[PDB]
Design a protein around this ligand. Structure first.
Ligand SMILES: CCCCCCCC/C=C\CCCCCCCC(=O)O[C@@H](COC(=O)CCCCCCCCCCCCCCCCC)COP(=O)(O)OCCN
Ligand SMILES: CCCCCCCC/C=C\CCCCCCCC(=O)O[C@@H](COC(=O)CCCCCCCCCCCCCCCCC)COP(=O)(O)OCCN
Ligand SMILES: *[C@@H]1O[C@H](CO)[C@@H](O)[C@H](O[C@@H]2O[C@H](CO)[C@@H](O)[C@H](O)[C@H]2NC(C)=O)[C@H]1NC(C)=O
Ligand SMILES: *[C@@H]1O[C@H](CO)[C@@H](O[C@@H]2O[C@H](CO)[C@@H](O)[C@H](O)[C@H]2NC(C)=O)[C@H](O)[C@H]1NC(C)=O
Ligand SMILES: C[C@H](NC[C@H](O)CP(=O)(O)Cc1ccccc1)c1ccc(Cl)c(Cl)c1
Ligand SMILES: *[C@@H]1O[C@H](CO)[C@@H](O)[C@H](O)[C@H]1NC(C)=O
Ligand SMILES: *[C@@H]1O[C@H](CO)[C@@H](O)[C@H](O)[C@H]1NC(C)=O
Ligand SMILES: [Mg+2]
Lengths: 669, 676
């Protein structure tokens, strides 16, 4: 019968390393042709396939094409082309000879430019079909942040530049982007610094091991990091321990060589029957993962040739290459094909095919399949009980921030507030005892009111300790901003009055020793009080102290950043220095007089020695307190307790040393 | 009869470079002129078969089939463009052919592992870079920046430029690319303040990027732009409906921009092999066109088509043998390769010689824009490192700028007159001190002086004298010292002042101390009290100088302006953590200085023997304390200034010394002189 001829271009030799792709698919073509012939679908005509080698060389490829055009018979189509350097040359020279091409192994995106390559169709999906799957893997698991690593080659840039274009409508946002050529570890470090947990890699076999090693060296792996990389590598490419620990947990992506679904296809078989037929047809020839596409190519070419032969009869053996109408007919016939095949259902959205992508995961020995994403339906399917994580929750692209206050714990605040009452009760008792004996000779000899002033000062100082503690969520936020002022006022007055009296008495003594009475002491104490009153008024009226918050720590699974509050103002160094200097100078002056007058004295005043001891004690106590304050401001709990102890001892030993003898003297006499 | 010889050619007539409108007639004329003469090829005629290609590789392979498998048999193939020459040069290896292209300017065709039978006349685009760097060197530039539209030619060009510039002690800074968005890449130049710029792109990219420039104000006197020259004059006075700027706004943005170029026509009027002059050739082929030579295409490239078909005949004459050429044998082609590899002669374009990679070398030309018109500046021949300037360049600032603003460091000093008077007063002070010491030591046997401690007074005088002397090294800095003899001054200052102050105050305090004590006086005890304080002071000073010495410390404050920036640097003779030492030494002295005043305010009226001058000592102690107290904080707070921190510390010492030495020593003279 009259034959219909077809051209074939593929490597066949053994020196070329890609000859395997031309030897591991011919059995499928033989099977398909045998079936087409037996079924008798082209009644008068039959097919006749012709083989031509290229060696995957630009020159060695053109010469074969040309020789075929000259010697060989009148061809009608071109079938094949695995190497991208020669097929990209041949695909542009078809509008002149009026031919059509069908490639099943070229996965380059350039061939999608339908301005230069209008007569090019293929089945195998391109490498720019992985991103619409990565997208719906991100959405499903609620991820937003990403880190992309690009290698400096056009193969990978051709998709790195297509990824950024599909995320426009979506909400994902590119956080970082690092590129490298030979040294990936600098980029790995620049990424680990940005604190990212999502990585989208694009690199070849070796650079994978390189980046894994340098990431382990950078500690960029664990239950808080996710890996995404290609998955078309060869098994056992790792051909140490540490490396395998940084690799596990990565997801690879490829295209599905052969569907698993069981359904009746157009050849009256099923994907599981054809697999056995093929594995039994080839004995020595090794396996290639492209046969499912050749088998479908044969059937699509037959179907379209028939559908075109139909329209031709209503108007094929002498087709000189100057036939434009026939070429247009065949082209418009190929755009209307849809059926079911071992690989799935075949459709053509502007040459490019709409097929199925598949994910895979590595679990300590090899990659295992997980999910299949079907492009023509936009539906993602996952299987459970096979995917796993390092943690029990889907990691996220962020870190949790916590704000602990460090406030007091109140195991001892109550204890101290209670101990503060002993002093108050003792002071009340002593004041009453002194008020009761206001007529005896002992109470009449010593100063009448100076002791009362001292006791009042002590009680006022005692209140200050109560005011110190309230902080760290004890009171409303609007209260802390109003307690510092009253606190400092109270403490100032309390320290002022008592020491004013304890100093005026020694002054009167020293003056009498060298050369009304009760009035001059009150006057000088009032003046000392006036100084501090004016100072405090000026401050409270100019710039009060406001509550400021400080954050300083990093305690790591959410990170916690603690916060604290400080009642300060900007200009604190001058204020503090002046106040401290003024009080220290007064204390030293008072202390010197007492030492000078240790033995000498004036009659009608029996409390000279004891008041001197009190002055010494108060001076040392205040010095220690002030020193401790500057040293332990970070730790708030210990400072509070030590300051409270200091205040208690200072304000209690004084009274216990002044009144006690005057009391036991009456108790005994 | 003459045995014929055919060749094949592909001429473009439409596309991105229609260079066949004017390169076909030239080669036809060459063929007829070389066939007329009977001195080159006697019995071998030449003929040509030409096809069209439109400068796209889709038609080219179809026509190459139509031209390589149908008789007759061809020998030499001539492709025009750079997108259909690559193809044929890759493919011809299997047919054993030679290719000679007259219009391809791509640096990738210079390889010899893929293209082993390729020759051309149009030089490459890697021939501007030697000129560029030999010109940078001439004007001392070491920091460059560049931007490039996206394409293979420009990428390879910039790569070669980087390789050539990274081998003569120069460094590159920035490389920004684009396709049609020149906004952000030109805006990101000001962010780095780049001034020397080389720009590689087509005309429209220019008319756009330059409006962007004018908007961003990237031009002036500190900006130099390098460009490429084949743009047509008047390329900025043309309407641009896709542009907002105007003509006069842009004509001020492209002022004074260099531009190189390659020259194809012999600028001289010397004759050549064919006995022809450039003027006798231009008009000769202009009498053979349809449109005008300003509206046609590929006119300035014809000389390279003429000067090529002559090389072929020259190298084919030697071989003389050709009627039997099959596409399989590879000996005839090797002979022709050896013949073409040894070419040297003169043509309408000059001396043509092929380098190792097929290409040829030529002279290049330089220009510059001077008022809406280009004005030549010089030529260059990269074969003999030659050059030919003209002394016609121009600059706005009478000279060309440099890569970056240089910073000059300045040093501040004192007035140089406030020091002389203050260093003079010290001499008077020391004279008074010596006079008083002499007056007190002369009389040494009277009871009036035996009562009041003479030794203590003398010690006070010695201390004051040392303090007065210590003032000299305090102002000596800069004009009167270098970087080597600097540390010798600080030690002087310290060891003089910290000695004199204490050596005086020791007596001036211990006297009142023992007085007030007895007021609540063996001579031996008094010496121990004084010696103790000085002994303590030396300990602190020695421990400071041992475990913490002072060498130097510069201070760099704000950089004032004058294209030169000046940053002034100070010079503090300091150390590490001096605040603590100064605080210690100031407090430990303020204690005594504030205690003695009270002690004196106490023993105001007490009377004793050998304690007569106690009131005078009290007055002296009153003045010293106030002066020292005021001066120390002020000096500490004014460490930045240089004049104030000298007055407030040089007056407060001479005043104290004088008021001290003219109080407890004046009455002695006023009395012993009036009473003999
Ligand atoms: C030497 C003498 C010095 C002692 C004289 C005290 C008189 C006036 C001092 C006034 C200081 C106001 C400071 C305001 C509060 C403050 O700054 O508070 C300071 C801490 O307190 C101090 O620094 C000053 C305490 C002085 C205690 C001195 C020891 C007791 C001596 C009293 C003896 C009296 C005997 C009577 C007989 C820190 O802040 P802040 O942001 O972390 O707060 C929030 C803390 N959660
Ligand atoms: C209160 C008592 C304090 C005074 C006691 C002085 C004793 C020892 C002080 C030693 C200080 C060494 C400092 C080294 C020089 C220095 O730092 O120099 C200081 C300036 O001088 C000072 O800060 C200290 C001066 C103290 C003057 C005190 C007033 C005179 C009182 C003397 C009375 C004596 C009466 C005798 C009777 C600044 O630097 P500098 O990088 O800008 O230099 C280069 C300047 N163009
Ligand atoms: C090629 O086949 C595709 C897939 O069916 C088809 O989209 C192209 O045109 C379809 O043509 C229809 C008219 O025949 C039109 O109604 C439809 O809108 C259009 N497809 C889309 C997505 O718009 C076909 N082109 C041809 C046959 O020239
Ligand atoms: C090259 O051309 C020049 C001038 O075009 C020739 O010299 C002219 O030669 C002709 C010969 O017919 C003489 O009659 C004229 O007198 C010459 N003119 C001048 C100005 O010298 C020269 O002979 C040519 N050389 C060749 C043909 O080899
Ligand atoms: C001097 C140079 N010679 C021309 C190359 O020979 C053509 P090319 O293929 O090497 C690069 C190319 C250039 C333009 C358009 C398509 C391609 C030249 C370049 C541009 C122009 Cl506009 C002109 Cl007039 C001349
Ligand atoms: C051509 O070759 C012949 C013989 O070798 C020689 O005499 C003649 O000079 C050559 N022509 C040229 C132009 O060199
Ligand atoms: C011819 O070319 C070869 C390399 O292609 C070179 O070694 C040789 O020097 C060339 N001949 C001459 C005369 O330069
Ligand atoms: Mg020009």
């Amino acid at each position: 019968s009259p034959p219909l001829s077809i051209m074939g271009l593929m490597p066949l030799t053994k020196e070329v390393a890609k000859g395997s792709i031309g030897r591991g698919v011919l059995p499928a073509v033989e099977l398909a042709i045998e079936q087409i012939r037996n079924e008798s679908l082209l009644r008068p005509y039959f097919l006749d396939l012709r083989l031509y080698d290229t060696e995957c060389d630009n020159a060695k490829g053109l010469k074969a094409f040309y020789d075929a055009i000259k010697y060989g018979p009148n061809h009608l189509m071109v079938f094949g082309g695995v190497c991208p350097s020669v097929t990209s040359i041949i695909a542009e020279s078809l509008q002149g000879w009026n031919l059509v091409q069908l490639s099943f192994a070229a996965t380059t995106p350039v061939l999608a430019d339908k301005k230069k390559y209008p007569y090019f169709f293929r089945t195998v999906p391109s490498d720019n079909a992985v991103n619409p799957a990565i997208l719906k893997l991100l959405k499903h698991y609620q991820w937003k942040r990403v880190g992309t690593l690009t290698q400096d080659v056009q193969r990978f840039s051709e998709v790195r530049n297509d990824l950024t274009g599909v995320l426009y409508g979506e909400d994902i946002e590119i956080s970082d982007t690092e590129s490298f050529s030979n040294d990936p570890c600098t980029s790995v470090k620049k990424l680990k610094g940005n604190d990212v947990r999502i990585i989208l890699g694009q690199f070849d076999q070796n650079m994978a091991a390189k980046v894994f090693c340098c990431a382990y060296e950078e500690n960029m792996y664990g239950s808080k990091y996710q890996w995404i990389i290609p998955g078309w590598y060869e098994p056992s490419w790792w051909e140490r321990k540490n490396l395998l620990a940084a690799m596990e947990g990565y997801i690879g992506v490829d295209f599905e060589p052969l569907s698993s679904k069981q359904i009746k296809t157009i050849s009256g078989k099923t994907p599981q029957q054809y697999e056995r037929e093929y594995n039994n047809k080839r004995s020595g020839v090794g396996p290639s993962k492209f046969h499912g596409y050749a088998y479908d190519g044969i059937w699509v070419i037959a179907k379209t040739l028939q559908r075109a032969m139909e329209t031709l009869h209503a108007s094929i053996q002498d087709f000189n290459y100057t036939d434009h109408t026939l070429g247009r007919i065949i082209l418009n016939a190929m755009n209307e094909t849809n059926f079911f095949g071992v690989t799935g259902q075949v459709v053509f959205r502007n040459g490019e095919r709409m097929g199925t992508i598949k994910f895979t995961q590595f679990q300590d020995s090899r990659e295992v399949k997980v999910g299949e994403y079907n492009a023509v339906a936009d539906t993602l399917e996952i299987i459970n009980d096979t995917i796993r994580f390092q943690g029990s929750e889907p990691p996220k692209d962020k870190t949790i921030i916590l704000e602990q206050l460090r406030k007091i714990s109140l195991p001892l605040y109550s204890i101290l507030s209670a101990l503060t009452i002993l002093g108050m009760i003792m002071a009340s008792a002593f004041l009453f005892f002194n008020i009761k004996n206001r007529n005896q000779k002992l109470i009449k000899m010593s100063s009448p009111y100076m002791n009362n002033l001292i006791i009042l000062g002590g009680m006022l100082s005692y209140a200050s300790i109560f005011l110190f503690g309230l902080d760290g969520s004890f009171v409303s936020e609007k209260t802390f901003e109003t307690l510092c002022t009253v606190r400092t006022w109270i403490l100032t007055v309390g320290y002022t009055t008592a020491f004013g009296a304890m100093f005026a008495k020694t002054w009167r003594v020293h003056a009498i020793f060298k050369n009304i009475k009760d009035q001059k002491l009150l006057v000088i104490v009032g003046g000392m009080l006036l100084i501090d009153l004016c100072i405090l008024i000026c401050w409270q009226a100019v710039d009060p102290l406001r509550r400021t918050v400080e954050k300083y720590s990093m305690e790591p699974d959410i990170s916690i950043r603690p916060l604290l509050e400080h009642c300060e103002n900007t200009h604190m160094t001058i204020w503090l220095g002046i106040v401290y200097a003024y009080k220290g100078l007064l204390m030293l002056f008072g202390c010197f007089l007492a030492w000078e007058t240790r033995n000498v004295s004036i009659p009608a005043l029996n409390d000279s020695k004891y008041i001197g001891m009190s002055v010494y004690n108060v001076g040392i106590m205040c010095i220690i307190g002030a020193a401790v304050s500057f040293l332990t401001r970070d730790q708030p709990n210990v400072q509070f307790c030590i300051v409270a102890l200091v205040i208690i001892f200072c304000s209690t030993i004084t009274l216990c040393l002044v009144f006690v003898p005057k009391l036991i003297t009456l108790r005994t006499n | 009869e003459r045995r014929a010889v055919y060749i094949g050619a592909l001429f473009p007539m439409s596309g991105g470079w229609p260079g066949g409108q004017a390169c076909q007639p030239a080669v036809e004329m060459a063929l007829e002129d070389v066939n007329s003469r009977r001195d080159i090829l006697p019995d071998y005629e030449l003929k040509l078969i030409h096809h069209d290609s439109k400068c796209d590789p889709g038609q080219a392979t179809k026509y190459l089939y139509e031209l390589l498998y149908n008789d007759p048999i061809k020998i030499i193939l001539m492709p025009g463009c750079s997108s259909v020459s690559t193809l044929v040069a890759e493919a011809a290896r299997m047919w054993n052919l030679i290719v000679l292209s007259y219009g391809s300017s791509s640096p990738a065709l210079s390889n010899r592992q893929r293209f082993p039978t390729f020759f051309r006349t149009h030089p490459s685009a890697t021939l501007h870079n030697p000129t560029r760097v030999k010109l940078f060197e001439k004007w001392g530039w070491k920091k460059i920046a560049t931007i490039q539209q996206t394409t293979e030619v420009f990428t390879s060009t910039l790569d070669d430029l980087e390789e050539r510039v990274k081998e003569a002690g120069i460094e590159i800074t920035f490389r920004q690319s684009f396709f049609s968005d020149p906004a952000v890449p030109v805006k990101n130049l000001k962010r780095q303040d780049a001034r020397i710029i080389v720009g590689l792109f087509y005309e429209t990219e220019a008319r756009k990027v330059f409006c962007e420039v004018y908007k961003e104000r990237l031009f002036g006197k500190k900006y130099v732009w390098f460009l490429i020259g084949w743009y047509a004059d008047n390329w900025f006075k043309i309407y641009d409906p896709s542009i907002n700027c105007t003509v006069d706004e842009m004509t001020e943005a492209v002022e004074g921009h260099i531009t190189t170029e390659i020259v194809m026509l012999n600028p001289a009027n010397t004759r050549s092999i064919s006995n022809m002059t450039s003027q006798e050739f231009v008009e000769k082929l202009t009498k053979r066109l349809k449109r005008h030579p300003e509206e046609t295409g590929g006119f300035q490239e014809a000389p390279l088509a003429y000067d090529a078909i002559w090389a072929l005949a020259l190298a084919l004459n030697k071989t003389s043998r050709l009627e039997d050429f099959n596409y399989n044998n590879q000996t005839i082609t090797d002979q022709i390769y050896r013949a073409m590899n040894s070419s040297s002669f003169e043509g309408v374009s000059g001396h043509v010689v092929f380098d190792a990679s097929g290409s040829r070398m030529a002279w290049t030309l330089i220009e510059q824009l001077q008022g809406g018109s280009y004005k030549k500046i010089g030529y260059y021949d990269s074969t003999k490192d030659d050059l030919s300037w003209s002394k016609t360049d121009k600059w706005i600032g009478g000279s060309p700028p440099a890569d970056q603003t240089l910073v000059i460091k300045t040093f501040r000093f004192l007035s140089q007159k406030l020091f002389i008077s203050v260093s003079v007063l010290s001499s008077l002070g020391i004279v008074l001190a010596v006079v008083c010491l002499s007056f007190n030591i002369y009389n040494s046997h009277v009871r009036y002086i035996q009562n009041s401690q003479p030794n203590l007074n003398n010690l006070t005088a010695v201390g004051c004298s040392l303090a007065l002397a210590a003032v000299f090294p305090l102002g000596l800095d800069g004009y009167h010292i270098g970087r080597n003899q600097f540390p010798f001054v600080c030690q002087a200052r310290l060891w003089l002042l910290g000695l004199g102050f204490s050596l005086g105050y020791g007596s001036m305090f211990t006297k009142i101390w023992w007085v007030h004590t007895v007021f609540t006086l063996e001579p031996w005890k008094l010496y121990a009290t004084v010696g103790l304080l000085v002994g303590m002071d030396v300990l602190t000073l020695a421990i400071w100088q041992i475990v913490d010495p002072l060498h130097r410390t510069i201070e760099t404050f704000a950089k004032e302006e004058p294209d030169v920036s000046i940053l002034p640097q100070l010079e503090h003779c300091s150390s590490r953590k001096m605040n603590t030492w100064l605080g210690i030494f100031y407090g430990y002295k303020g204690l005594l200085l504030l205690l003695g005043i009270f002690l004196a305010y106490e023993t105001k009226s007490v009377s004793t023997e050998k304690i007569n001058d106690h009131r005078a000592v009290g007055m002296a102690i009153y003045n010293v304390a106030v002066l020292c107290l005021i001066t120390a904080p002020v000096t500490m707070i004014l460490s930045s200034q240089q004049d104030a921190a000298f007055a407030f510390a040089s007056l407060a010492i001479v005043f104290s010394s004088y008021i001290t030495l003219v109080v407890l020593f004046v009455p002695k003279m006023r009395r012993l002189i009036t009473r003999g």
